[PDB]
Amino acid sequence: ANQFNSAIGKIQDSLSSTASALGKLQDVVNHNAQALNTLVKQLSSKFGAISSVLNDIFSRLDPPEAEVQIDRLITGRLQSLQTYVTQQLIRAAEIRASANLAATKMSECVLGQSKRVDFCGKGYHLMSFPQSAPHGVVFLHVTYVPAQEKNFTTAPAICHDGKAHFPREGVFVSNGTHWFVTQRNFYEPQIITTDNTFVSGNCDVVIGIVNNTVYDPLQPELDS
Amino acid sequence: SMTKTSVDCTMYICGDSTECSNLLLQYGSFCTQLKRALTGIAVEQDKNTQEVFAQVKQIYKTPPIKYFGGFNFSQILPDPSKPSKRSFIEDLLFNKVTKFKGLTVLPPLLTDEMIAQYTSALLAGTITSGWTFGAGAALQIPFAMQMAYRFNGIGVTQNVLYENQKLIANQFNSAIGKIQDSLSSTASALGKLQDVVNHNAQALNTLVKQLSSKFGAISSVLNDIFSRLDPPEAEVQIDRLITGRLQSLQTYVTQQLIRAAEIRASANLAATKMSECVLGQSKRVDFCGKGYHLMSFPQSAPHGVVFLHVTYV
Amino acid sequence: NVFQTRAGCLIGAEYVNNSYECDIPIGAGICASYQTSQSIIAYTMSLGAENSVAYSNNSIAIPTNFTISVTTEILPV
């Protein structure tokens, strides 16, 4: 509760200062801002005609002479629309490909636990918090990242009575004296028991096997 | 990634005459935004190399004493004796993939020597550091303890690995030698990467052959119109040649935006399989390869990436 | 005051041997940045810091600590 409550406040201090984290949504607006200012600047272009004003063509010329110059100005304004609407079909295909990516992360990451790596956020996934955004969505990914590291002494199997003891769930570690059973994500040293080990095979076919005594809890319970 | 190109408006449309450059002020912003559309392709081609090839910002190196599980890993590791850092498979991958009119070729940002140092860093994190290299700081897991916990995701215990470990080295080293012999014999497996060269070559050979076509005009030379015909009759025949070359330029920019969208979904499929199959273990069928998944080996490739999937059959 | 790249000739920059995270790309591995009496320098890109992990048969590393971090991804809709 000390680590999680400070981690949400670092998101609030970053979004109040740095504005470039939301700039992927600002490129949605600025590509549309150049698209609506595209067709305004095409009206001032002469398109090969003398003047771009349609009242300065038909009222200044013969009606045989106007229909050549008017049909150049319409076809130049048709080609400005054929560059516009084709650009609106291509740029919305990148939005709808990202909308299916956003609807996958609303389904998989938010509604349940997902085992995926670099999808629901970096590291081991816990949960996701959706937040609303203009023309988009803002995800908050709560992840599990281990920090400190310590080197231990391992072995794949433990030889006791002549049968190899394989670990069921866990790893075999040692501090240099006694062999302990811990887990991959965390350090919790335990006493070696028959319920935590699995018995298969002999000791000859295992490369790197070590000798220790597997503690049986039933052996103190015989006389008690 | 694809080949980044740029089109000059002055040299391609005009035949280097003073009459053609004065008539583009009436046409204006036609070829201005088409150069901006090819610029925005070339920004996104550099973003495809950042998402796929480099998953992490940390570089791992191979230890100089090599014994890994009784296996031969030297075909995917780069050669320190050569000045270029390349593995034995990537020597075969680079060699099978095969005048200035105002069209230029933009060079790529990330060089192919720096792609292989993203490749040799993430192969070092897979072998030495386990699956924890992309999910956090790199731990030290021995290689006999890596594949025992990679069998536990698909339902196989540790009885299969430790007894049969000498029989895995006959199976794994013979299967990876058939991959090296097949890529050296035939170039048809790399033919998806050869079409990225070929569809960019047919687009550039389309655009340079539209200059010889007449486009409705009498002559295709702008110097032959101005030195012969009258200047009221020259402005009809020159402006047919300007408009017909811009329709070939409108064809060229639109087809490259469709191929940029097809190479975006393939790179997002590639950056998914770097994040899932290479950096972790998946339980999926026909995603990380056919059958059960164990591990995945990325390799460097021109205009792409070659995945080596280790499957359990 | 002048430097030859594989992309072409670059005039107005100073070639340095330091390699770190840059800002303005040029191409073919050469990248430009403006840092400090101030000028624009061009150099070869960094891949990150050097880390060489240890390897032996008998050594395992188990983490003793964990840190919960919050990351933010923005997808347009």
PDB file of C-alpha atoms in Angstrom, chain A residues 34-222:
ATOM      1  CA  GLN A  34      -3.984  19.577 -42.462  1.00  0.00           C
ATOM      2  CA  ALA A  35      -6.777  17.705 -44.263  1.00  0.00           C
ATOM      3  CA  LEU A  36      -9.418  20.397 -43.720  1.00  0.00           C
ATOM      4  CA  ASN A  37      -6.899  23.101 -44.654  1.00  0.00           C
ATOM      5  CA  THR A  38      -6.027  21.158 -47.815  1.00  0.00           C
ATOM      6  CA  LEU A  39      -9.266  21.925 -49.672  1.00  0.00           C
ATOM      7  CA  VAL A  40      -9.260  25.607 -48.669  1.00  0.00           C
ATOM      8  CA  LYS A  41      -5.876  26.214 -50.330  1.00  0.00           C
ATOM      9  CA  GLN A  42      -6.914  24.372 -53.514  1.00  0.00           C
ATOM     10  CA  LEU A  43      -9.572  27.016 -54.263  1.00  0.00           C
ATOM     11  CA  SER A  44      -6.927  29.711 -54.839  1.00  0.00           C
ATOM     12  CA  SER A  45      -5.064  27.629 -57.439  1.00  0.00           C
ATOM     13  CA  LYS A  46      -5.686  28.629 -61.047  1.00  0.00           C
ATOM     14  CA  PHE A  47      -5.576  24.996 -62.432  1.00  0.00           C
ATOM     15  CA  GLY A  48      -4.242  26.198 -65.807  1.00  0.00           C
ATOM     16  CA  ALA A  49      -7.152  28.638 -66.235  1.00  0.00           C
ATOM     17  CA  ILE A  50      -6.681  32.420 -66.224  1.00  0.00           C
ATOM     18  CA  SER A  51      -8.650  33.021 -63.017  1.00  0.00           C
ATOM     19  CA  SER A  52      -9.967  30.610 -60.396  1.00  0.00           C
ATOM     20  CA  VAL A  53     -13.174  32.589 -59.733  1.00  0.00           C
ATOM     21  CA  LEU A  54     -16.127  31.077 -61.613  1.00  0.00           C
ATOM     22  CA  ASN A  55     -17.812  34.491 -61.856  1.00  0.00           C
ATOM     23  CA  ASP A  56     -14.636  35.771 -63.561  1.00  0.00           C
ATOM     24  CA  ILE A  57     -14.837  33.115 -66.309  1.00  0.00           C
ATOM     25  CA  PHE A  58     -18.438  32.820 -67.524  1.00  0.00           C
ATOM     26  CA  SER A  59     -19.256  36.533 -67.265  1.00  0.00           C
ATOM     27  CA  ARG A  60     -15.954  37.633 -68.853  1.00  0.00           C
ATOM     28  CA  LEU A  61     -15.957  35.273 -71.871  1.00  0.00           C
ATOM     29  CA  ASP A  62     -18.042  33.819 -74.691  1.00  0.00           C
ATOM     30  CA  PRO A  63     -20.274  30.810 -73.806  1.00  0.00           C
ATOM     31  CA  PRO A  64     -18.263  28.659 -76.245  1.00  0.00           C
ATOM     32  CA  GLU A  65     -15.095  30.092 -74.670  1.00  0.00           C
ATOM     33  CA  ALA A  66     -16.265  29.636 -71.063  1.00  0.00           C
ATOM     34  CA  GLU A  67     -17.032  25.904 -71.197  1.00  0.00           C
ATOM     35  CA  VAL A  68     -13.422  24.957 -71.898  1.00  0.00           C
ATOM     36  CA  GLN A  69     -12.194  27.042 -68.951  1.00  0.00           C
ATOM     37  CA  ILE A  70     -15.007  26.073 -66.541  1.00  0.00           C
ATOM     38  CA  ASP A  71     -14.476  22.332 -67.167  1.00  0.00           C
ATOM     39  CA  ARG A  72     -10.781  22.694 -66.341  1.00  0.00           C
ATOM     40  CA  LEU A  73     -11.735  24.264 -62.998  1.00  0.00           C
ATOM     41  CA  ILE A  74     -14.291  21.575 -62.106  1.00  0.00           C
ATOM     42  CA  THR A  75     -11.906  18.698 -62.952  1.00  0.00           C
ATOM     43  CA  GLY A  76      -9.152  20.297 -60.869  1.00  0.00           C
ATOM     44  CA  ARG A  77     -11.615  20.463 -57.978  1.00  0.00           C
ATOM     45  CA  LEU A  78     -12.595  16.838 -58.613  1.00  0.00           C
ATOM     46  CA  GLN A  79      -8.945  15.767 -58.353  1.00  0.00           C
ATOM     47  CA  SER A  80      -8.577  17.692 -55.089  1.00  0.00           C
ATOM     48  CA  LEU A  81     -11.484  15.658 -53.707  1.00  0.00           C
ATOM     49  CA  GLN A  82     -10.055  12.395 -55.083  1.00  0.00           C
ATOM     50  CA  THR A  83      -6.863  13.065 -53.132  1.00  0.00           C
ATOM     51  CA  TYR A  84      -8.899  13.915 -50.015  1.00  0.00           C
ATOM     52  CA  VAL A  85     -11.379  11.018 -49.744  1.00  0.00           C
ATOM     53  CA  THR A  86      -8.751   8.400 -50.666  1.00  0.00           C
ATOM     54  CA  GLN A  87      -6.566   9.800 -47.859  1.00  0.00           C
ATOM     55  CA  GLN A  88      -9.520   9.539 -45.455  1.00  0.00           C
ATOM     56  CA  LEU A  89      -9.952   5.845 -46.311  1.00  0.00           C
ATOM     57  CA  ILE A  90      -6.266   5.024 -45.727  1.00  0.00           C
ATOM     58  CA  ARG A  91      -5.839   6.962 -42.461  1.00  0.00           C
ATOM     59  CA  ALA A  92      -9.039   5.526 -40.958  1.00  0.00           C
ATOM     60  CA  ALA A  93      -7.745   2.020 -41.697  1.00  0.00           C
ATOM     61  CA  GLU A  94      -4.897   2.670 -39.251  1.00  0.00           C
ATOM     62  CA  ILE A  95      -7.443   3.845 -36.664  1.00  0.00           C
ATOM     63  CA  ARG A  96      -9.679   0.770 -37.081  1.00  0.00           C
ATOM     64  CA  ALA A  97      -6.644  -1.522 -36.885  1.00  0.00           C
ATOM     65  CA  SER A  98      -5.781   0.184 -33.593  1.00  0.00           C
ATOM     66  CA  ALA A  99      -9.439   0.046 -32.513  1.00  0.00           C
ATOM     67  CA  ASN A 100      -9.343  -3.751 -32.722  1.00  0.00           C
ATOM     68  CA  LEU A 101      -6.095  -3.623 -30.741  1.00  0.00           C
ATOM     69  CA  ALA A 102      -7.782  -1.384 -28.150  1.00  0.00           C
ATOM     70  CA  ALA A 103     -10.860  -3.629 -27.931  1.00  0.00           C
ATOM     71  CA  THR A 104      -8.601  -6.646 -27.370  1.00  0.00           C
ATOM     72  CA  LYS A 105      -6.926  -4.939 -24.393  1.00  0.00           C
ATOM     73  CA  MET A 106     -10.318  -3.939 -22.995  1.00  0.00           C
ATOM     74  CA  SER A 107     -11.389  -7.579 -23.237  1.00  0.00           C
ATOM     75  CA  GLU A 108      -8.242  -9.452 -22.203  1.00  0.00           C
ATOM     76  CA  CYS A 109      -6.320  -7.126 -19.878  1.00  0.00           C
ATOM     77  CA  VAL A 110      -9.138  -5.268 -18.094  1.00  0.00           C
ATOM     78  CA  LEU A 111     -11.811  -7.956 -17.616  1.00  0.00           C
ATOM     79  CA  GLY A 112      -9.468 -10.732 -16.493  1.00  0.00           C
ATOM     80  CA  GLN A 113      -5.899 -11.855 -15.903  1.00  0.00           C
ATOM     81  CA  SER A 114      -3.678 -12.351 -18.955  1.00  0.00           C
ATOM     82  CA  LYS A 115      -0.330 -14.163 -19.084  1.00  0.00           C
ATOM     83  CA  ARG A 116       0.960 -12.235 -22.114  1.00  0.00           C
ATOM     84  CA  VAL A 117       4.327 -10.450 -22.182  1.00  0.00           C
ATOM     85  CA  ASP A 118       4.571  -6.806 -23.446  1.00  0.00           C
ATOM     86  CA  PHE A 119       0.836  -6.731 -24.277  1.00  0.00           C
ATOM     87  CA  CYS A 120      -0.889  -5.798 -20.990  1.00  0.00           C
ATOM     88  CA  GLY A 121       2.281  -3.947 -19.868  1.00  0.00           C
ATOM     89  CA  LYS A 122       5.890  -4.852 -19.189  1.00  0.00           C
ATOM     90  CA  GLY A 123       6.434  -7.635 -16.683  1.00  0.00           C
ATOM     91  CA  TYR A 124       3.954  -9.927 -14.991  1.00  0.00           C
ATOM     92  CA  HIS A 125       0.397  -8.651 -15.402  1.00  0.00           C
ATOM     93  CA  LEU A 126      -1.897  -7.955 -12.461  1.00  0.00           C
ATOM     94  CA  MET A 127      -4.764  -5.718 -13.632  1.00  0.00           C
ATOM     95  CA  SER A 128      -5.508  -2.850 -16.012  1.00  0.00           C
ATOM     96  CA  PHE A 129      -7.355   0.427 -15.387  1.00  0.00           C
ATOM     97  CA  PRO A 130      -9.083   2.068 -18.385  1.00  0.00           C
ATOM     98  CA  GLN A 131      -9.401   5.857 -18.459  1.00  0.00           C
ATOM     99  CA  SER A 132     -11.371   7.886 -20.995  1.00  0.00           C
ATOM    100  CA  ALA A 133      -9.632  10.164 -23.497  1.00  0.00           C
ATOM    101  CA  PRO A 134     -10.662  12.431 -26.383  1.00  0.00           C
ATOM    102  CA  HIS A 135     -10.536  10.393 -29.649  1.00  0.00           C
ATOM    103  CA  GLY A 136      -8.966   7.456 -27.824  1.00  0.00           C
ATOM    104  CA  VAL A 137      -8.410   5.696 -24.510  1.00  0.00           C
ATOM    105  CA  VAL A 138      -5.721   5.786 -21.794  1.00  0.00           C
ATOM    106  CA  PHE A 139      -4.681   2.505 -20.154  1.00  0.00           C
ATOM    107  CA  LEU A 140      -3.092   2.176 -16.707  1.00  0.00           C
ATOM    108  CA  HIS A 141      -1.168  -1.098 -16.399  1.00  0.00           C
ATOM    109  CA  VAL A 142      -0.443  -2.482 -12.918  1.00  0.00           C
ATOM    110  CA  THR A 143       2.555  -4.809 -13.287  1.00  0.00           C
ATOM    111  CA  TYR A 144       4.741  -7.032 -11.088  1.00  0.00           C
ATOM    112  CA  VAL A 145       8.468  -6.259 -11.449  1.00  0.00           C
ATOM    113  CA  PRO A 146      11.121  -7.921  -9.230  1.00  0.00           C
ATOM    114  CA  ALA A 147      13.957  -5.662  -8.079  1.00  0.00           C
ATOM    115  CA  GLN A 148      16.864  -6.993  -5.976  1.00  0.00           C
ATOM    116  CA  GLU A 149      18.975 -10.021  -6.921  1.00  0.00           C
ATOM    117  CA  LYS A 150      20.940 -12.539  -4.856  1.00  0.00           C
ATOM    118  CA  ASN A 151      23.028 -15.471  -6.116  1.00  0.00           C
ATOM    119  CA  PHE A 152      22.390 -18.972  -4.714  1.00  0.00           C
ATOM    120  CA  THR A 153      23.831 -22.467  -5.178  1.00  0.00           C
ATOM    121  CA  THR A 154      21.605 -24.917  -7.091  1.00  0.00           C
ATOM    122  CA  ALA A 155      21.375 -28.608  -8.173  1.00  0.00           C
ATOM    123  CA  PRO A 156      18.705 -30.418 -10.258  1.00  0.00           C
ATOM    124  CA  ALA A 157      18.108 -33.345  -7.876  1.00  0.00           C
ATOM    125  CA  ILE A 158      18.764 -34.619  -4.349  1.00  0.00           C
ATOM    126  CA  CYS A 159      19.993 -38.186  -3.784  1.00  0.00           C
ATOM    127  CA  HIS A 160      18.987 -39.811  -0.493  1.00  0.00           C
ATOM    128  CA  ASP A 161      18.177 -43.540  -0.425  1.00  0.00           C
ATOM    129  CA  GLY A 162      19.323 -44.267  -3.986  1.00  0.00           C
ATOM    130  CA  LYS A 163      16.233 -42.736  -5.612  1.00  0.00           C
ATOM    131  CA  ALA A 164      16.399 -39.242  -7.082  1.00  0.00           C
ATOM    132  CA  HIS A 165      14.199 -36.566  -5.494  1.00  0.00           C
ATOM    133  CA  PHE A 166      12.920 -34.122  -8.144  1.00  0.00           C
ATOM    134  CA  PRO A 167      11.214 -30.840  -7.145  1.00  0.00           C
ATOM    135  CA  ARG A 168       7.451 -30.639  -7.602  1.00  0.00           C
ATOM    136  CA  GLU A 169       6.815 -26.878  -7.543  1.00  0.00           C
ATOM    137  CA  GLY A 170       9.909 -24.832  -6.773  1.00  0.00           C
ATOM    138  CA  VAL A 171      13.684 -24.651  -7.121  1.00  0.00           C
ATOM    139  CA  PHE A 172      16.581 -26.003  -5.062  1.00  0.00           C
ATOM    140  CA  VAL A 173      18.811 -23.302  -3.546  1.00  0.00           C
ATOM    141  CA  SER A 174      21.606 -23.292  -0.980  1.00  0.00           C
ATOM    142  CA  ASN A 175      23.415 -20.694   1.124  1.00  0.00           C
ATOM    143  CA  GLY A 176      26.582 -22.828   1.177  1.00  0.00           C
ATOM    144  CA  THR A 177      25.601 -25.117   4.064  1.00  0.00           C
ATOM    145  CA  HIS A 178      21.994 -26.348   3.908  1.00  0.00           C
ATOM    146  CA  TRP A 179      19.845 -26.942   0.833  1.00  0.00           C
ATOM    147  CA  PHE A 180      16.568 -24.996   0.760  1.00  0.00           C
ATOM    148  CA  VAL A 181      13.415 -25.077  -1.367  1.00  0.00           C
ATOM    149  CA  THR A 182      12.296 -21.672  -2.664  1.00  0.00           C
ATOM    150  CA  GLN A 183      10.322 -20.323  -5.627  1.00  0.00           C
ATOM    151  CA  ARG A 184      11.325 -18.538  -8.819  1.00  0.00           C
ATOM    152  CA  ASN A 185       9.604 -15.226  -8.035  1.00  0.00           C
ATOM    153  CA  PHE A 186      10.565 -14.838  -4.358  1.00  0.00           C
ATOM    154  CA  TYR A 187      12.821 -16.082  -1.560  1.00  0.00           C
ATOM    155  CA  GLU A 188      10.979 -18.175   1.043  1.00  0.00           C
ATOM    156  CA  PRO A 189      13.299 -20.885   2.457  1.00  0.00           C
ATOM    157  CA  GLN A 190      11.569 -24.101   3.519  1.00  0.00           C
ATOM    158  CA  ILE A 191      12.356 -27.483   5.045  1.00  0.00           C
ATOM    159  CA  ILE A 192      12.703 -30.262   2.442  1.00  0.00           C
ATOM    160  CA  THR A 193       9.737 -32.647   2.768  1.00  0.00           C
ATOM    161  CA  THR A 194       8.378 -35.641   0.876  1.00  0.00           C
ATOM    162  CA  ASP A 195       5.266 -33.666  -0.124  1.00  0.00           C
ATOM    163  CA  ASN A 196       7.450 -30.999  -1.776  1.00  0.00           C
ATOM    164  CA  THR A 197       9.572 -33.559  -3.668  1.00  0.00           C
ATOM    165  CA  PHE A 198       8.850 -36.173  -6.329  1.00  0.00           C
ATOM    166  CA  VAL A 199      10.532 -39.585  -6.399  1.00  0.00           C
ATOM    167  CA  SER A 200      11.475 -41.036  -9.788  1.00  0.00           C
ATOM    168  CA  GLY A 201      14.486 -42.912 -11.132  1.00  0.00           C
ATOM    169  CA  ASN A 202      17.855 -43.617  -9.557  1.00  0.00           C
ATOM    170  CA  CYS A 203      20.801 -41.349  -8.746  1.00  0.00           C
ATOM    171  CA  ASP A 204      23.110 -42.613 -11.512  1.00  0.00           C
ATOM    172  CA  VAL A 205      21.384 -41.092 -14.561  1.00  0.00           C
ATOM    173  CA  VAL A 206      21.089 -37.533 -13.174  1.00  0.00           C
ATOM    174  CA  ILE A 207      23.945 -35.164 -14.041  1.00  0.00           C
ATOM    175  CA  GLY A 208      24.768 -32.879 -11.122  1.00  0.00           C
ATOM    176  CA  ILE A 209      22.893 -34.709  -8.360  1.00  0.00           C
ATOM    177  CA  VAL A 210      23.837 -33.955  -4.732  1.00  0.00           C
ATOM    178  CA  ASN A 211      23.435 -35.855  -1.469  1.00  0.00           C
ATOM    179  CA  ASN A 212      21.250 -34.598   1.388  1.00  0.00           C
ATOM    180  CA  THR A 213      18.712 -36.078   3.833  1.00  0.00           C
ATOM    181  CA  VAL A 214      15.036 -35.719   2.913  1.00  0.00           C
ATOM    182  CA  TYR A 215      13.106 -35.044   6.114  1.00  0.00           C
ATOM    183  CA  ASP A 216      10.139 -37.370   6.659  1.00  0.00           C
ATOM    184  CA  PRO A 217       7.466 -35.919   9.012  1.00  0.00           C
ATOM    185  CA  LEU A 218       6.044 -39.412   9.688  1.00  0.00           C
ATOM    186  CA  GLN A 219       9.283 -40.594  11.355  1.00  0.00           C
ATOM    187  CA  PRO A 220       8.913 -38.383  14.506  1.00  0.00           C
ATOM    188  CA  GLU A 221       5.202 -39.362  14.550  1.00  0.00           C
ATOM    189  CA  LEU A 222       5.901 -43.097  14.991  1.00  0.00           C
TER     190      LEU A 222
END
